[PDB]
Design a protein around this ligand. Structure first.
Ligand SMILES: COc1ccccc1CNc1cc(NC[C@H]2CCNC[C@@H]2O)nc2c(C(C)C)cnn12
Lengths: 286, 65, 279
């Protein structure tokens, strides 16, 4: 085509990503449904904090997708010991993630794969949601989805309890986990199994009650845990202010209906309080 | 260099859709199927279906090709 | 959302004349290729349109008896794919019986209607070897169909707007005591609007509202106050004029629709298979 290969960027089990000239090219059942999902969703979306699909082409039952080239991701930022993550940096990353997510949610799409390495960063410091291979439209009672979505460490408790019907909470919980990972620099809730994921969630944040989550027991794979009191958030996050703790509390509410939406999160005092989010050019470059 | 919220202003080219919060107040939710407790526990409410249906009904109703 | 969708941006055209131009370009360009390769073998554009209408009916009833039951959104997506494909391609180059199956096959994936290729092809009345050969043909044409759609796969159908209008009527228009009796006759009218080119000329909301008001008129209920005071069009008079004109134009597209004649199709199919056996 009109794109000359320059570098090999990565290998996921459904596609090989390579730099090209700068863009990133991602190369009996027919064309793969993950690629078709990416095409069909990203063609209908245009926002600065969502990865832009620039073109698609291919041959036979193969296909390649052209994307804006991204410099790094949030996982590399988190794991880089030499980068100090000031509160302004965390505010900037959260703001961009939430604005992209607000736009995505107004168009009735859930990302369902939010994690630090899916929050890509470009050379201008602009964060973009990427990897829409699990993304799906929501708001339709005619559609029933799967619960195993979202990587385990970022999977919301209603997904772990097996919710076949869910809204934006599955994204917001992951957002909270990402936020926690930005604060602690280690995965907040690193469960090695779904049961162990729920165990770590309840050990840290407390076992929810009926008042906390009225229909908790109606989820098909619900199962009862020991009453863990939970660790108060200000003990877990010892350097966070009250505004940040309120945001974290909102993102980790066990009730998915009560869990704060992207719009509600953006309206919180934390984002409007001092200090302001750093400009993109000043964000730390690994 | 502080941030302030400003809502997404995207032209729908159609009649105004009432907010999620107001749908029960305005009597819309009387005409959609209620969310089951299993659906509610996952965060799915009838308000979502109602809001999306109204948004699609009004989207581009006035637009000319 | 429709209002910033690819369907609105690229696949809603100004007039029926423009669609006629696009189809004429397609027919002319295939004729130029056929003469540059090696007379009344060719189909005229109205002959192509007759065959396209016949094969769209075939696509409809293929989806109608498809097992497992196919959602209406998938069917509408597949029909829109068929219409869009033949705007810029000739039935003499790509056979509509393969293309309609490919459209259904792709719409099943796009609308997340999980179907295995074996159970997709099991719906064809063919010997198993014929099912395999059909599947191979579909897999051959899948990327071609996607390219000819310009990778615009999300199709906004009138069904959810229809439901939303019913909600809004039940909630805000009490003088229509029971809007639900408007459903059947509106649905019928939607099905007629779908046979025309309206899906390429009007927004899905406009189509749904036209069907609803046509149903109300068939029941002799007037709905001018729903438009003027509920949708608040009495405050922007030119908007009400434009909307009423759109709905009248749609009703006339349905009025002047001519189904393919069976003798016509019988002859045109022989011409089409003659075109595809040769070349
Ligand atoms: C090696 O240096 C790094 C390091 C970290 C992040 C990015 C780069 C280089 N750039 C890059 C890699 C990349 N890897 C494929 C997936 C891997 C799992 N997480 C989602 C990713 O997309 N994908 C893209 C895109 C598109 C295809 C979204 C645009 N840039 N880019």
């Amino acid at each position: 085509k009109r794109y000359e290969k320059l570098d090999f960027l990565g290998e996921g089990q459904f596609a090989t990503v390579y730099k090209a000239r700068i863009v990133a090219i991602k190369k009996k059942d027919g064309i793969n449904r993950t690629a078709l999902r990416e095409i069909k969703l990203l063609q209908e979306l245009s926002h600065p904090n969502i990865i832009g699909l620039l073109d698609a082409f291919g041959h036979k039952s193969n296909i390649s997708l052209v994307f804006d080239f991204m410099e790094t991701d949030l996982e590399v930022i988190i794991k880089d010991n030499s980068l100090v993550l000031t509160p302004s940096h965390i505010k900037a990353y959260m703001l961009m993630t939430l604005q992209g997510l607000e736009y995505l949610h107004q168009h009735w799409i859930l990302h369902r794969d939010l994690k630090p390495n899916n929050l890509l960063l470009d050379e201008n410091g602009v964060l973009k949601l990427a990897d829409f291979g699990l993304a799906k439209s929501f708001g339709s009672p005619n559609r029933a989805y799967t619960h195993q979505v979202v990587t385990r460490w970022y999977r919301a408790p209603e997904l772990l309890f097996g919710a076949r019907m869910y809204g934006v909470g599955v994204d917001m919980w992951a957002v909270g986990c990402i936020l926690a990972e930005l604060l602690l620099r280690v995965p907040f809730l690193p469960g090695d199994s779904d049961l162990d994921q729920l165990t770590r969630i309840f050990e840290t944040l407390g076992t929810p009650t009926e008042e906390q989550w009225p229909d908790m027991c109606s989820l098909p794979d619900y199962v009862t845990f020991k009453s863990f009191p939970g660790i108060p958030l200000h003990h877990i996050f010892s350097a966070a202010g009250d505004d940040l703790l309120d945001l974290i509390q909102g993102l980790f509410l066990f009730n998915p209906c009560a869990r704060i939406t992207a719009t509600q999160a953006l309206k919180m005092k934390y984002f409007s309080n001092r200090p302001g989010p750093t400009p993109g050019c000043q964000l730390p470059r690994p | 260099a502080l941030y302030e919220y400003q809502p997404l202003q995207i032209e729908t080219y159609g009649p105004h859709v009432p907010e999620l919060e107001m749908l029960g107040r305005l009597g819309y939710l009387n005409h959609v199927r209620a969310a089951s407790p299993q659906d509610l526990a996952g965060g799915y409410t009838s308000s979502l279906a109602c809001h999306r249906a109204l948004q699609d009904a009004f989207s581009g109703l006035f637009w000319q090709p | 959302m429709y209002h910033n969708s690819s369907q609105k941006r690229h696949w809603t055209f100004s007039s029926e004349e423009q669609l006629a131009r696009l189809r004429a370009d397609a027919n002319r360009k295939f004729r130029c290729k056929a003469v540059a390769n090696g007379d009344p073998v060719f189909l005229e554009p109205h002959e192509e349109m007759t065959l396209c209408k016949y094969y769209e009916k075939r696509l409809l009833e293929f989806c109608s008896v498809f097992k497992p039951a196919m959602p209406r959104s998938v069917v509408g997506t597949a029909c829109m794919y068929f219409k869009r494909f033949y705007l810029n391609n000739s039935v003499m180059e790509y056979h509509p019986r393969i293309i309609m199956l490919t459209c259904a096959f792709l719409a099943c994936k796009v609308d997340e209607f999980n179907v295995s290729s074996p159970q997709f092809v099991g719906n064809l009345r063919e010997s198993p070897l014929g099912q395999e050969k059909a599947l191979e043909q579909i897999l051959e044409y899948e990327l071609l169909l996607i390219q000819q759609l310009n990778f615009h796969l999300i199709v906004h159908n009138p069904y959810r707007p229809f439901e939303g209008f019913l909600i809004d009527l039940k909630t805000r228009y009490p003088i229509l005591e029971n809007p639900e009796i408007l459903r059947k006759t509106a649905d019928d009218f939607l099905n007629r609007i779908a046979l025309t080119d309206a899906y390429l000329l009007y927004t899905p909301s406009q189509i749904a509202l036209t069907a609803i008001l046509s149903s109300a008129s068939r029941a002799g209920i007037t709905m001018e106050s729903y438009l003027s005071e509920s949708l608040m069009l009495k405050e922007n008079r030119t908007c009400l004029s434009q909307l009423l004109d759109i709905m009248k134009s749609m009703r006339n597209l349905v009025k002047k629709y001519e189904p393919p004649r069976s003798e016509e199709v019988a002859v045109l199919k022989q011409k089409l298979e003659r075109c595809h056996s040769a070349e």
